[PDB]
Amino acid sequence: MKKLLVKELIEQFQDCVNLIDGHTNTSNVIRVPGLKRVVFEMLGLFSSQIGSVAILGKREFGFLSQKTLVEQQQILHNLLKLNPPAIILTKSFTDPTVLLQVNQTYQVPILKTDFFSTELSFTVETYINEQFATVAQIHGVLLEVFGVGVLLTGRSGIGKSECALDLINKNHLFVGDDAIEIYRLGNRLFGRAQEVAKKFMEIRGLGIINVERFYGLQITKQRTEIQLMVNLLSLEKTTVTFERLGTELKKQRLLGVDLSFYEIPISPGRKTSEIIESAVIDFKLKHSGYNSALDFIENQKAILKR
Amino acid sequence: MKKLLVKELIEQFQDCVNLIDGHTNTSNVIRVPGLKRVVFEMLGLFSSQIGSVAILGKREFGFLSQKTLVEQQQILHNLLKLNPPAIILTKSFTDPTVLLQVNQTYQVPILKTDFFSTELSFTVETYINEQFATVAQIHGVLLEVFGVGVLLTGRSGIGKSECALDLINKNHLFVGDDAIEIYRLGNRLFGRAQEVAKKFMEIRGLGIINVERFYGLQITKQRTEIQLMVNLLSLGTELKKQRLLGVDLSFYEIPISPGRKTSEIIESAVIDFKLKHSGYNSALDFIENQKAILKRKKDE
Amino acid sequence: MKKLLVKELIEQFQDCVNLIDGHTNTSNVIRVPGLKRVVFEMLGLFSSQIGSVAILGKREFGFLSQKTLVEQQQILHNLLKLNPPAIILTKSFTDPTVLLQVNQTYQVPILKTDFFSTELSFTVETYINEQFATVAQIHGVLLEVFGVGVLLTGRSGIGKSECALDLINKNHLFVGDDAIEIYRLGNRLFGRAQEVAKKFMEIRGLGIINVERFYGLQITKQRTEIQLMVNLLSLETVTFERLGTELKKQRLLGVDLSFYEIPISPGRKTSEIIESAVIDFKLKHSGYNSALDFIENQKAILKR
Amino acid sequence: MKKLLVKELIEQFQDCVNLIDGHTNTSNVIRVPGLKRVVFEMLGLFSSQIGSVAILGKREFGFLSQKTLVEQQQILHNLLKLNPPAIILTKSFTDPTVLLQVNQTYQVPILKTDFFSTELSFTVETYINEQFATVAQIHGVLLEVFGVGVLLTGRSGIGKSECALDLINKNHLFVGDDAIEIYRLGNRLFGRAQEVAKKFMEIRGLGIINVERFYGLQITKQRTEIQLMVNLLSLEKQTVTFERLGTELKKQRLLGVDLSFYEIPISPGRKTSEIIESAVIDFKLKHSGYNSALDFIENQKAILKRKKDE
Amino acid sequence: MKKLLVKELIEQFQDCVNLIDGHTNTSNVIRVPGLKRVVFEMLGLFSSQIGSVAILGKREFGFLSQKTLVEQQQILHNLLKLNPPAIILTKSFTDPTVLLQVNQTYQVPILKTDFFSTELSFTVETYINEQFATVAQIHGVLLEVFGVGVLLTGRSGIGKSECALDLINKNHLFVGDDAIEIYRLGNRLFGRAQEVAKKFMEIRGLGIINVERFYGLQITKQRTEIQLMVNLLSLTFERLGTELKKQRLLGVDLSFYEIPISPGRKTSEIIESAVIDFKLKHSGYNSALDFIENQKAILKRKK
Amino acid sequence: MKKLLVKELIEQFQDCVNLIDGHTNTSNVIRVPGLKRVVFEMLGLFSSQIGSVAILGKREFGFLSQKTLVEQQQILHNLLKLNPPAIILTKSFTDPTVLLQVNQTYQVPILKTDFFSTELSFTVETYINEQFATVAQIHGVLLEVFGVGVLLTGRSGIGKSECALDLINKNHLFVGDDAIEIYRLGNRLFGRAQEVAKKFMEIRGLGIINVERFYGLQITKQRTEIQLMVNLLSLEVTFERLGTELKKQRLLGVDLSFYEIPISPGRKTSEIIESAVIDFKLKHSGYNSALDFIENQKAILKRK
């Protein structure tokens, strides 16, 4: 993982975060995610080194405000002596005077904001958390089709790549081939190409081509939310029978997230690129609450009436 | 078959037809096509119930005119008692006085029109007949390509369904799949999906998909005049034909082969079809050219 | 109008018809539509020259089937006497022997068929009638878009033509420009090109061009069932609806057609607005009204 | 804001969360974001109700492990007493017996997971937090073109909707028209249609049309990450040579997020949708390091040099 | 080879020439390409039958515009005697006095051109020489994609013809199918359809199709400069593209590609891809080399 | 002209041309175009300095082979003393031994080639003449559409540039925008982007873009033969309905087929440009839509 420095946080949120102290240690490393609540540390119950950004908001300020200036100093000393990467004060932390006082010695980067704890939860916090998100490397081809992230799997190998080329000519977005990586954020799964892969792709008879140099930046994308998995089956699918009524919806879990599963057969005479498109259309349609199969069966019954 | 009612007719021809009597019997069903002519029963020869809309025009208004009001009543009585679905009066029948008076007993729906018997033949009458057209069920795929109705046949159900989707992606019109049906109207042949088919179509890996919800109404069509038939097998100087339900459709037979998409071939067949129908035969042109070259070798 | 000769009828229904007389006059010009019932003439009451094909089915059979041979002979003659362009005999008219003899002296081309009276109504009769349908010349541009016949109007001048070329480039079917004609068949309306127009069209800067030779037969059609009419408005001052639940109509030659008025606007493609109207026409026709769905949705949200 | 229910939470994470108690209350409403640390309340210092999901991890398990049974029951009662919508136990909270016991009355939904608090930060917590993101309504058109979220602004609503329809016919993704709303998530800005707008759009001559029903799901998307902002001007008002060339990319901050800014006039003789597409490609190229303007200038220099080199 | 009659030239540049004197030998053929100078012939040094269109310009005029009248006829005779097909005259000549004189017993066709000696290199000269090009008949498909002449080779009936159809629908140009011919003009190879092939094409299951009447005159082209060759393989290959293959043909080395025809995949798009790759490599970009420099640059993780 | 030197001609054909003598005078200036024939001078009948590249083919070599060694040198001395900028030897001139001996003093650049006389006309001569052609700078947009070079002219800001973009996405080729230059070769006209313009294009409200980097190198081309000219206009007007003939306009001495087209709102200009090309190609093949329309109308009237 790449180290997340305090200055990086600053620069990335210069709109809602202001550095008011500890200017010289803005190079501190944030080694743990989340906006750490440190009441235990403040009450002198815990005393382990702090590796995440600490937060003082309404609650902390209210507690401190009922204590004497001397007491507050003792309390804040318990916190700062633990070397937190930095400390962020919400708009509720109205008077940071005593903090800066105690901080004169430590000089821990102090960041002021006009956001409430709640507003920092889906902004500054969410940002920090995703930098630590677990990422795994896998094989396959990623594209975004009809605004839906699709992961192309199979055994043909180069067959999948040639299929991504087909979709590209249909103006769909290419993310990466073979050497890709995924990561879960919230209840969503995301994929992007590894540095080695980038936008290169091997096509039989052509070798390694640069998709971007060939068809422009209009057909590539840095990342995509994977929501669909398509498995391309070779000519030796004759072990497979195909679903007549796709009333249900098959799934497959990848890195914790469940992905809708489709198994398509490569058939001579028709365009594979367009059978994949139909699957995606199937998916979006079902997600909106419409199932062709079900509707079909209801149609049969409606007609059946002696 | 779906019930044809007197109300349907009226509602369907509001622009040129008006109900002047039998107001409470517009719920009558029409069981026989055509604007029936009732000269036989008028004079009192046939006594069987009339199951079709009877027409009275010039030939009948003049006839009754030279008849006594008693005779005129007897005649109109022999008709109205036969229980006809309705009776239309042409612009010729200028005086329903006696008719209406005699009809206040049976209250048969009486429709008045400003059209002549001839003008009703290609309007009201043709509308009614079409409803009773004989319809037959068959197998295959129905689509309209380049405005040409195309019936796809073959043993492989996969070959057909796949070629169809590819054609849909080419923005051709999808009429129906597998459970289709045809009917004849004049010298033209028409096709449409059965009720259990609508716009559904099975596709390996996806099962049954609603073509219309998948790709929109700009991609489907209720019916199509079948003019061409293409059989799919899992020179061209002659335009092969084949008859279906009494109609002659042009016939093409193409082999599904790897290295080429079936849809593009169907497209080429259709263009070929239109070209030939316009008088241009590629194969012949090729022959004439090759021929002219040899007559140019007469230089030595 | 073009003449409908008996021969043409035979050659057109050779699958269920069979000529058996009047071979020399198959060139008999039909001047009147419909399979005319001639019972009135079979009784001398009416005796005027017949100008339309005559029919004799099960009904006309039972009548002669129980009349004495001199009845048949005398009745049958009063018919041919009028000189009917032709006379078809249903399948139920089994054994025309008596009729064959009386006609054996008349130059009347009689056609036999294996179809009953009912089956002929929506086949042979339909064909004949259609030939006589009323035709009307009008202006405008004709095309079929998404399988829907469309009549472009709006007195926008060649602007219409120019907009049709746009549609043709999107692969829609072209039928005719300027010199067109329409005809009503049943409860449906049809349009096609007049012989002088065919597939020619004037385009500013190129003059009259032949779309068929320019883009091939794949973008033309002989005729279309007209269902929608779009009126293009030039920049010259109106106010457009905000909902569009209405969906107005407009009667043409007896047929009601949906009416759309769209503005020609800069920076946008006119062809696509037209396409959109056709889609709107078809969705609504299927039971889906965007405006109504928008309001229902807006109502549900408030009910909270 | 749509109500966030505990049961909804369990569904999105059936892979790493197991409801172990308080089953009948799974319909509890989560009113406040974040996995709340309840130290202050465990120690009886604060006593306000709780509207967010509380968390008990290593830290809390060790503090309690130090106390006697009665002490823990005391502490645990303080918490459950504040009526939290639910409580999640990290993998470090190895023995929930005492809690389960004290909770036999309150029946608060207790969630168990084998994830460590750190692993929860970017999974369960991220999901929850994002559900409460601040939303602002604004006026404009949202689409995703060439995989890039584009926000269209301008006084002319007609010029905007018409452009939208044209882009739609280009297979770009439609998000919403006129009645839209943006929300910030992390350091990224997102946008979507308000419930009243959905995928409906007003086009003159037609009125309101449902883009989704008209052109299919192929061209709609629920949300997009806004990266580009293009303001369409009615008139074509003009001056600096390097500015009309496009040497440096202009920006604009919206809801705290900096977006690339473009301003283009609507004009006959060219379809607006085409210019939008070009801006997007320009945005991407410059972002990948290639600047047409600067390159154009280098070309001049290179030409001038050879011309000045004998 | 379609004999090149002097007449064909008359109706080829009638907007610059003007047939005068000797209209009897216009039915004469052109056995030799080019616009030969006959200074040797004139002086009698050379005594061989002229097989190509001769030319009397400014130079050969002033040379006789100083010679005696007994000599002018003693030179113009040594030329017309060899029976030259035609004698084009430049503006810097004029006064065909003695010329039309001695030609009264030869009646050899002569013309006048508003052009000058210099304006005949890229006009009359070039046109004539192409007729004599050495054409070779081969089997394949000729198309022009993104401005680049492409020759599609491969076994009979495997998709080649259909592939061209798809290309044509993406607005690329069609030259010929199967019965084609090639020839070298200088240092470039060109391809056209054999007279018998024209723009006709055979589609299995359909027969002979006229691409022109099917998809339009606009997507057909009479000639194309072949620069790329793509061999389509029926049902191994390089994984890299560093080494750009070539394949000699009629003395011209063309860029060579060889790709598989695979079901479901659109062959036409791979053909375009090769052209892009082709144009890309010639501009200075090699996807393979870049891919390698990328791995190496990343392999700098040893720091 | 930028002044053409022999070394530049040598550099241009490094493959089929080898310098075998006179290497220090490779700076000779070619003052006259075309490959000069010098039989007269070889025979000493002419004695004026040669300012163009001379040529020795099968004829010259064949003549020398029959003469004696002393005579060959005399003949060559006559040629060489006229100081031609250079001499090119065809594939037929297989033995330059004697020429080199004599050229030992004059040291005139000698170029051995593998080309035949007939081949040189396409290669070397064309180049030389191209280098002597007059290059004029002009405004407009150059594209190759369906293989035809098209020059789009008109006022600035009407949309000429944007049009190239829609064409490019149809897979046509872009050559240059605004700063273009043309030059004539015989009766044909050529155009290309000026070096300062290359494939850059300015789009109002956007700035400078690079077509190659925006839409791909594939859809761009260096040079094109201009065959038709199209002047686009903005309106606020009746156009020729017939146009029985292909209008023309002279540009740098070359008559181009001329089209005058309006930029109509809502309509795609690019497609009107494609129609002109199609129209152009059609008429050149012998088909004129208006004329066909005219005859069609006459025939109809004739059927009276």
PDB file of C-alpha atoms in Angstrom, chain D residues 152-308:
ATOM      1  CA  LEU D 152     -24.723  20.767 -18.232  1.00  0.00           C
ATOM      2  CA  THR D 153     -25.726  24.252 -17.135  1.00  0.00           C
ATOM      3  CA  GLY D 154     -27.173  27.334 -18.778  1.00  0.00           C
ATOM      4  CA  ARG D 155     -30.136  29.703 -18.742  1.00  0.00           C
ATOM      5  CA  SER D 156     -31.625  28.070 -21.861  1.00  0.00           C
ATOM      6  CA  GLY D 157     -33.432  24.974 -20.614  1.00  0.00           C
ATOM      7  CA  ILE D 158     -34.421  24.209 -24.214  1.00  0.00           C
ATOM      8  CA  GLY D 159     -30.824  24.213 -25.397  1.00  0.00           C
ATOM      9  CA  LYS D 160     -30.003  21.869 -22.547  1.00  0.00           C
ATOM     10  CA  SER D 161     -32.759  19.252 -23.023  1.00  0.00           C
ATOM     11  CA  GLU D 162     -32.262  19.217 -26.779  1.00  0.00           C
ATOM     12  CA  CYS D 163     -28.549  18.620 -26.366  1.00  0.00           C
ATOM     13  CA  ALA D 164     -29.419  15.831 -23.941  1.00  0.00           C
ATOM     14  CA  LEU D 165     -31.682  14.086 -26.434  1.00  0.00           C
ATOM     15  CA  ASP D 166     -28.979  14.398 -29.119  1.00  0.00           C
ATOM     16  CA  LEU D 167     -26.351  12.869 -26.760  1.00  0.00           C
ATOM     17  CA  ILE D 168     -28.818  10.123 -25.911  1.00  0.00           C
ATOM     18  CA  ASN D 169     -29.122   9.291 -29.577  1.00  0.00           C
ATOM     19  CA  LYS D 170     -25.328   8.990 -29.457  1.00  0.00           C
ATOM     20  CA  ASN D 171     -25.663   6.171 -26.899  1.00  0.00           C
ATOM     21  CA  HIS D 172     -24.358   8.251 -23.999  1.00  0.00           C
ATOM     22  CA  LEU D 173     -25.900   7.674 -20.541  1.00  0.00           C
ATOM     23  CA  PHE D 174     -28.771   9.822 -19.296  1.00  0.00           C
ATOM     24  CA  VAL D 175     -29.088  10.517 -15.581  1.00  0.00           C
ATOM     25  CA  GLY D 176     -31.613  13.302 -15.190  1.00  0.00           C
ATOM     26  CA  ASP D 177     -32.903  16.596 -16.507  1.00  0.00           C
ATOM     27  CA  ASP D 178     -33.609  19.919 -14.856  1.00  0.00           C
ATOM     28  CA  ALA D 179     -34.636  18.683 -11.396  1.00  0.00           C
ATOM     29  CA  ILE D 180     -31.312  17.221 -10.315  1.00  0.00           C
ATOM     30  CA  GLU D 181     -29.316  16.920  -7.090  1.00  0.00           C
ATOM     31  CA  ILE D 182     -25.671  16.490  -6.275  1.00  0.00           C
ATOM     32  CA  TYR D 183     -24.007  14.973  -3.227  1.00  0.00           C
ATOM     33  CA  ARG D 184     -20.391  14.722  -2.178  1.00  0.00           C
ATOM     34  CA  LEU D 185     -18.919  11.323  -1.313  1.00  0.00           C
ATOM     35  CA  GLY D 186     -15.307  11.350  -0.176  1.00  0.00           C
ATOM     36  CA  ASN D 187     -13.405  13.762  -2.415  1.00  0.00           C
ATOM     37  CA  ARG D 188     -15.686  12.875  -5.306  1.00  0.00           C
ATOM     38  CA  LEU D 189     -18.888  14.593  -6.469  1.00  0.00           C
ATOM     39  CA  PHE D 190     -21.945  12.643  -7.578  1.00  0.00           C
ATOM     40  CA  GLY D 191     -25.252  13.511  -9.198  1.00  0.00           C
ATOM     41  CA  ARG D 192     -28.629  11.975  -9.888  1.00  0.00           C
ATOM     42  CA  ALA D 193     -32.236  12.808 -10.680  1.00  0.00           C
ATOM     43  CA  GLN D 194     -34.628  13.901  -7.970  1.00  0.00           C
ATOM     44  CA  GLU D 195     -37.518  11.524  -7.340  1.00  0.00           C
ATOM     45  CA  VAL D 196     -39.831  13.899  -9.165  1.00  0.00           C
ATOM     46  CA  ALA D 197     -37.616  13.940 -12.265  1.00  0.00           C
ATOM     47  CA  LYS D 198     -36.617  10.262 -12.573  1.00  0.00           C
ATOM     48  CA  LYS D 199     -35.791   9.681 -16.222  1.00  0.00           C
ATOM     49  CA  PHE D 200     -38.541  12.034 -17.477  1.00  0.00           C
ATOM     50  CA  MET D 201     -37.599  14.879 -19.831  1.00  0.00           C
ATOM     51  CA  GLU D 202     -39.474  17.744 -21.470  1.00  0.00           C
ATOM     52  CA  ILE D 203     -38.958  18.115 -25.213  1.00  0.00           C
ATOM     53  CA  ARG D 204     -40.946  20.758 -27.131  1.00  0.00           C
ATOM     54  CA  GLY D 205     -43.458  19.365 -29.587  1.00  0.00           C
ATOM     55  CA  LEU D 206     -43.737  16.245 -27.481  1.00  0.00           C
ATOM     56  CA  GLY D 207     -44.049  17.413 -23.917  1.00  0.00           C
ATOM     57  CA  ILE D 208     -42.789  15.051 -21.221  1.00  0.00           C
ATOM     58  CA  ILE D 209     -41.145  11.812 -22.411  1.00  0.00           C
ATOM     59  CA  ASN D 210     -39.714   8.978 -20.377  1.00  0.00           C
ATOM     60  CA  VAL D 211     -36.158   8.589 -21.727  1.00  0.00           C
ATOM     61  CA  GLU D 212     -35.937   5.150 -20.182  1.00  0.00           C
ATOM     62  CA  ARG D 213     -39.102   3.776 -21.780  1.00  0.00           C
ATOM     63  CA  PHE D 214     -38.302   5.558 -25.067  1.00  0.00           C
ATOM     64  CA  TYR D 215     -34.697   4.477 -25.516  1.00  0.00           C
ATOM     65  CA  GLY D 216     -34.188   1.755 -22.929  1.00  0.00           C
ATOM     66  CA  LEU D 217     -32.004   1.025 -19.949  1.00  0.00           C
ATOM     67  CA  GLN D 218     -29.081   0.953 -22.398  1.00  0.00           C
ATOM     68  CA  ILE D 219     -28.971   4.726 -22.071  1.00  0.00           C
ATOM     69  CA  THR D 220     -29.839   5.528 -18.503  1.00  0.00           C
ATOM     70  CA  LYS D 221     -27.836   5.397 -15.293  1.00  0.00           C
ATOM     71  CA  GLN D 222     -28.898   6.048 -11.680  1.00  0.00           C
ATOM     72  CA  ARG D 223     -25.918   8.207 -10.755  1.00  0.00           C
ATOM     73  CA  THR D 224     -22.710   9.524 -12.196  1.00  0.00           C
ATOM     74  CA  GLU D 225     -19.484  10.932 -10.759  1.00  0.00           C
ATOM     75  CA  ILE D 226     -19.411  14.506 -12.001  1.00  0.00           C
ATOM     76  CA  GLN D 227     -15.966  15.532 -13.276  1.00  0.00           C
ATOM     77  CA  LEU D 228     -16.772  17.998 -15.995  1.00  0.00           C
ATOM     78  CA  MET D 229     -19.055  21.007 -16.046  1.00  0.00           C
ATOM     79  CA  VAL D 230     -20.155  22.600 -19.319  1.00  0.00           C
ATOM     80  CA  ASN D 231     -22.123  25.863 -19.317  1.00  0.00           C
ATOM     81  CA  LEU D 232     -23.955  26.632 -22.595  1.00  0.00           C
ATOM     82  CA  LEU D 233     -24.199  30.310 -23.520  1.00  0.00           C
ATOM     83  CA  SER D 234     -26.967  31.666 -25.761  1.00  0.00           C
ATOM     84  CA  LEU D 235     -24.956  34.414 -27.460  1.00  0.00           C
ATOM     85  CA  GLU D 236     -21.366  34.008 -28.630  1.00  0.00           C
ATOM     86  CA  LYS D 237     -19.532  36.644 -26.585  1.00  0.00           C
ATOM     87  CA  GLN D 238     -15.749  36.753 -27.103  1.00  0.00           C
ATOM     88  CA  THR D 239      -9.782  37.561 -26.030  1.00  0.00           C
ATOM     89  CA  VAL D 240      -6.231  36.710 -24.850  1.00  0.00           C
ATOM     90  CA  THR D 241      -4.457  34.570 -27.470  1.00  0.00           C
ATOM     91  CA  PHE D 242      -3.533  31.816 -24.936  1.00  0.00           C
ATOM     92  CA  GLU D 243      -7.081  31.776 -23.515  1.00  0.00           C
ATOM     93  CA  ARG D 244      -8.894  31.280 -26.833  1.00  0.00           C
ATOM     94  CA  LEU D 245      -6.389  28.512 -27.547  1.00  0.00           C
ATOM     95  CA  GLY D 246      -7.103  26.569 -24.366  1.00  0.00           C
ATOM     96  CA  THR D 247      -3.601  26.392 -22.917  1.00  0.00           C
ATOM     97  CA  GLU D 248      -4.740  25.777 -19.337  1.00  0.00           C
ATOM     98  CA  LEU D 249      -7.825  24.014 -18.016  1.00  0.00           C
ATOM     99  CA  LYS D 250     -10.269  26.192 -16.080  1.00  0.00           C
ATOM    100  CA  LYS D 251     -12.122  24.933 -12.988  1.00  0.00           C
ATOM    101  CA  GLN D 252     -15.117  25.534 -10.773  1.00  0.00           C
ATOM    102  CA  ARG D 253     -15.891  24.350  -7.279  1.00  0.00           C
ATOM    103  CA  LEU D 254     -19.287  22.786  -6.676  1.00  0.00           C
ATOM    104  CA  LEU D 255     -20.198  21.497  -3.212  1.00  0.00           C
ATOM    105  CA  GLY D 256     -16.522  21.585  -2.224  1.00  0.00           C
ATOM    106  CA  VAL D 257     -15.370  19.570  -5.261  1.00  0.00           C
ATOM    107  CA  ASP D 258     -13.296  21.106  -8.049  1.00  0.00           C
ATOM    108  CA  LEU D 259     -14.626  20.361 -11.515  1.00  0.00           C
ATOM    109  CA  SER D 260     -13.098  21.075 -14.909  1.00  0.00           C
ATOM    110  CA  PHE D 261     -15.017  23.920 -16.499  1.00  0.00           C
ATOM    111  CA  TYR D 262     -15.940  24.498 -20.120  1.00  0.00           C
ATOM    112  CA  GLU D 263     -18.227  27.161 -21.579  1.00  0.00           C
ATOM    113  CA  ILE D 264     -19.629  26.748 -25.061  1.00  0.00           C
ATOM    114  CA  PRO D 265     -22.180  28.683 -27.111  1.00  0.00           C
ATOM    115  CA  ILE D 266     -25.142  26.974 -28.798  1.00  0.00           C
ATOM    116  CA  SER D 267     -24.950  27.707 -32.527  1.00  0.00           C
ATOM    117  CA  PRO D 268     -26.587  26.725 -35.837  1.00  0.00           C
ATOM    118  CA  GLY D 269     -24.264  25.026 -38.302  1.00  0.00           C
ATOM    119  CA  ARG D 270     -23.134  22.618 -35.620  1.00  0.00           C
ATOM    120  CA  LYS D 271     -24.790  20.256 -33.173  1.00  0.00           C
ATOM    121  CA  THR D 272     -24.113  21.072 -29.542  1.00  0.00           C
ATOM    122  CA  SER D 273     -23.795  17.359 -28.673  1.00  0.00           C
ATOM    123  CA  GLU D 274     -20.698  17.160 -30.912  1.00  0.00           C
ATOM    124  CA  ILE D 275     -18.947  19.968 -29.064  1.00  0.00           C
ATOM    125  CA  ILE D 276     -19.752  18.312 -25.715  1.00  0.00           C
ATOM    126  CA  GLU D 277     -18.168  15.077 -26.893  1.00  0.00           C
ATOM    127  CA  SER D 278     -15.039  16.978 -27.934  1.00  0.00           C
ATOM    128  CA  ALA D 279     -14.798  18.701 -24.558  1.00  0.00           C
ATOM    129  CA  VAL D 280     -14.900  15.360 -22.811  1.00  0.00           C
ATOM    130  CA  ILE D 281     -12.124  13.950 -24.982  1.00  0.00           C
ATOM    131  CA  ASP D 282     -10.175  17.183 -24.395  1.00  0.00           C
ATOM    132  CA  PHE D 283     -10.726  16.862 -20.657  1.00  0.00           C
ATOM    133  CA  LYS D 284      -9.378  13.300 -20.698  1.00  0.00           C
ATOM    134  CA  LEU D 285      -6.351  14.022 -22.877  1.00  0.00           C
ATOM    135  CA  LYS D 286      -5.271  17.027 -20.796  1.00  0.00           C
ATOM    136  CA  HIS D 287      -5.799  14.813 -17.717  1.00  0.00           C
ATOM    137  CA  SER D 288      -3.543  12.203 -19.289  1.00  0.00           C
ATOM    138  CA  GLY D 289      -1.009  14.945 -19.892  1.00  0.00           C
ATOM    139  CA  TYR D 290      -1.628  15.867 -23.547  1.00  0.00           C
ATOM    140  CA  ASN D 291      -2.586  19.527 -24.163  1.00  0.00           C
ATOM    141  CA  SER D 292      -3.549  20.344 -27.760  1.00  0.00           C
ATOM    142  CA  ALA D 293      -2.979  24.100 -27.280  1.00  0.00           C
ATOM    143  CA  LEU D 294       0.500  23.707 -25.777  1.00  0.00           C
ATOM    144  CA  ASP D 295       1.351  21.133 -28.442  1.00  0.00           C
ATOM    145  CA  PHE D 296       0.155  23.515 -31.151  1.00  0.00           C
ATOM    146  CA  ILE D 297       2.543  26.111 -29.730  1.00  0.00           C
ATOM    147  CA  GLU D 298       5.452  23.645 -29.592  1.00  0.00           C
ATOM    148  CA  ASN D 299       4.818  22.848 -33.249  1.00  0.00           C
ATOM    149  CA  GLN D 300       5.235  26.535 -34.050  1.00  0.00           C
ATOM    150  CA  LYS D 301       8.470  26.722 -32.076  1.00  0.00           C
ATOM    151  CA  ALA D 302       9.853  23.599 -33.747  1.00  0.00           C
ATOM    152  CA  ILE D 303       9.015  24.997 -37.159  1.00  0.00           C
ATOM    153  CA  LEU D 304      10.486  28.398 -36.310  1.00  0.00           C
ATOM    154  CA  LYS D 305      13.682  26.802 -34.998  1.00  0.00           C
ATOM    155  CA  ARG D 306      14.494  24.860 -38.183  1.00  0.00           C
ATOM    156  CA  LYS D 307      13.579  27.981 -40.154  1.00  0.00           C
ATOM    157  CA  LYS D 308      16.085  29.783 -37.919  1.00  0.00           C
TER     158      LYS D 308
END
